[PDB]
Design a protein around this ligand. Structure first.
Ligand SMILES: CC1CC[C@]2(CO)CO[C@H](c3ccc(O)cc3)[C@H]1[C@@H]2C
Ligand SMILES: CC1CC[C@]2(CO)CO[C@H](c3ccc(O)cc3)[C@H]1[C@H]2C
Lengths: 10, 245, 236, 10
């Protein structure tokens, strides 16, 4: 789980 | 199967300028002398907000979308502070002796003394900014440099999960080669001889090693401040930090 | 002056001629590895290499035209990047291995003998693999190593402008090498960039290695030589 | 003067 993941995924 | 390679130099430049993130403000409040806690809160709050716009910028860098999620993550984790820093140095170019963190947060080196151990980092950023203004760095060259950092910094640390041997990343190197081509085009277009083109290409890329050095020093300084836990860092900022140490 | 009046060919000969020798380690194979002994081998080797490196620097065109103070600073900044670029170069034809000395070739598995060291070995092994992919030439290697000496401390100290004119001469020399090898103009600028971008990774590894070395100094695993200590303390 | 300094002077 990473904030980066959802920011990238949008 | 990547649009990036089909772009002409003009198209590459245009796409990169179009990708530029906005300039953000710091939280207004005229209350002066900053304290150590105040300054760090301001700088980390800012960087946290810049990070969100950096992700959007990254996704608009030709060739970045073609990578897997995990590769995108690895590249951003490696390069985020270098990218914030070169951005900062760029913004600060036309204010010699000062760092333009935001339009309403213009700091001199004396203000770096507010935070223990920060002035060293301030001094390196200011030297880089003078170096850029002394080279007459152009906006078009800058966006090329910033994208090179995104794609280059983490590229040699794609190691296989077991055995940890270097996975070769042909796509990324092809895009990097396209950006190099684009930089040379800009220099030719500005009227430089071939010799001046190659000389200037080298000068600009050598600065990226200084920018790497500053990122590593800043990363250690950041980690030091979170250990003393003066400032509360956003979870995003902590995760980016945690990717290094 | 002198350095600025060299032909590209003359630059290459000068740099080639100045190369230091490859030293042997005191590795005794009848001596089981421990964290303390491996660290002792590696730092004793580094210590001896520094003496040759200091005398190599004197022979890099332009270097002795700098003040003694500037020479000291350049070497203090770049010494570990230079040892590391030499290491990776030496290791290039031994995939999976770091050739610290001809009698000391180490695996990543061997690096695990020292805490925190394996992540540094991995970065060095990856750099060696990159050199292999690019087919780095000896003439390109000596240029890059000289670029590191002159570039690494240049923005953290006029004669500073002298340093950049010599750097430009070395750039000119790399291009000459590439034109002579048959590369097109496009290929020449592209390989030039590829070579200078690895200096960013070399800096990174040097940064990391310096923190690892310092953590070993504080842990008192093995006695550090006086020169190595001074080279290390120049970074903090 | 440091060690590096004198080795450079030699
Ligand atoms: C992200 C940073 C946080 C705090 C610092 C010292 O701990 C000082 O600020 C640096 C910074 C902040 C915002 C930027 O846009 C660029 C660098 C950089 C540096 C680590
Ligand atoms: C000078 C050094 C001593 C011990 C190390 C562990 O911290 C591993 O060895 C490194 C080294 C030694 C000799 C070389 O030619 C290159 C790197 C480097 C350091 C990372």
């Amino acid at each position: 789980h990473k904030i980066l993941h959802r920011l990238l995924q949008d | 199967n990547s649009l990036a390679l089909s772009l002409t130099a003009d198209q590459m430049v245009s796409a990169l300028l179009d990708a530029e993130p906005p300039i953000l403000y710091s939280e207004y409040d005229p209350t002066r002398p900053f304290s150590e806690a105040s300054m760090m809160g301001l700088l980390t709050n800012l960087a946290d907000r810049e990070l969100v716009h950096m992700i959007n910028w990254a996704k608009r860098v030709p060739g970045f979308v073609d990578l897997t999620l995990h590769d995108q993550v690895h590249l951003l984790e490696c390069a985020w502070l270098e990218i914030l820093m070169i951005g900062l140095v760029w913004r600060s170019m036309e204010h010699p002796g000062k760092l333009l963190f935001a339009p309403n947060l213009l700091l001199d080196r004396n203000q770096g003394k507010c935070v223990e151990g920060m002035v060293e980092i301030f001094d390196m950023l200011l030297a880089t900014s003078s170096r850029f203004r002394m080279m007459n760095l152009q906006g078009e060259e800058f966006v090329c440099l910033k994208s090179i950092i995104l794609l280059n910094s983490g590229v040699y640390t794609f190691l296989s999960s077991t055995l940890k041997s270097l996975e070769e990343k042909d796509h990324i190197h092809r895009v990097l080669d396209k950006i190099t081509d684009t930089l040379i085009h800009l220099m030719a277009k500005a009227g430089l001889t071939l010799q001046q083109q190659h000389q200037r290409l080298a000068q600009l890329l050598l600065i990226l090693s200084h920018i790497r050095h500053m990122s590593n020093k800043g990363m250690e300084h950041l980690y030091s401040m979170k250990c003393k836990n003066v400032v509360p860092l956003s979870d995003l900022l902590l995760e980016m930090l945690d990717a290094h140490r």
